[PDB]
Amino acid sequence: GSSGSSGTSPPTLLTVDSVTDTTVTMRWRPPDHIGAAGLDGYVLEYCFEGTEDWIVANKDLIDKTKFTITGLPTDAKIFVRVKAVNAAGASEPKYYSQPILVKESGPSSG
């Protein structure tokens, strides 16, 4: 059977940058190294609660290391997951320990 997977490393340091009742922001860092073939952008998916299928977010490829899910219902919990996609294959998906709530939040002294 087909032998040969992505020899690159998946997206690490996955954390939420900012959150807005309108949309949510997610940032991540690149892999320590890149496979010979070469890294081809990245992919980000999100599954809505109450469903059994994930909803694509990125159209083609995510150039920047940040992504924002547009069009999100206020007070809604969604699961974010990213992975590495190279011409060789793909890496395992990253599951954020805790979900990202699409709710506004500001700084609080103390």
Describe this structure in words.
The structure is a monomer. With 110 residues, the protein is an all-beta fold. The chain has one domain (6-103): Immunoglobulin-like (Sandwich). It is built from no helices and nine strands. The radius of gyration is 15 Å and the shape is globular. Belongs to the immunoglobulin superfamily. MyBP family. The modification Phosphotyrosine is found at residue 95. Residues 12-104 form the Fibronectin type-III domain. This is Myosin-binding protein C, slow-type.
Task: Give me the CATH fold name.
Answer: Immunoglobulin-like
Number of domains: 1
Strand/helix succession: EEEEEEEEE
Return the CATH class.
Answer: Mainly Beta
The number of distinct β-strands equals 9
Sheet with the most strands, sense and barrel status: 6 strands, antiparallel
CATH architecture descriptor: Sandwich
Give the proportion of residues in helices: under 10%
Structural class: mainly beta
Q: Please compute the radius of gyration using only Cα atoms.
A: 15 Å
What global shape is seen?
Answer: globular
How far apart are the termini? 58 Å
Number of helices: 0
Going by CATH, the homologous superfamily would be Immunoglobulins
Domain Fibronectin type-III: 12-104
Modified residues (Phosphothreonine): 70
Protein name: Myosin-binding protein C, slow-type
Modified residues (Phosphotyrosine): 95
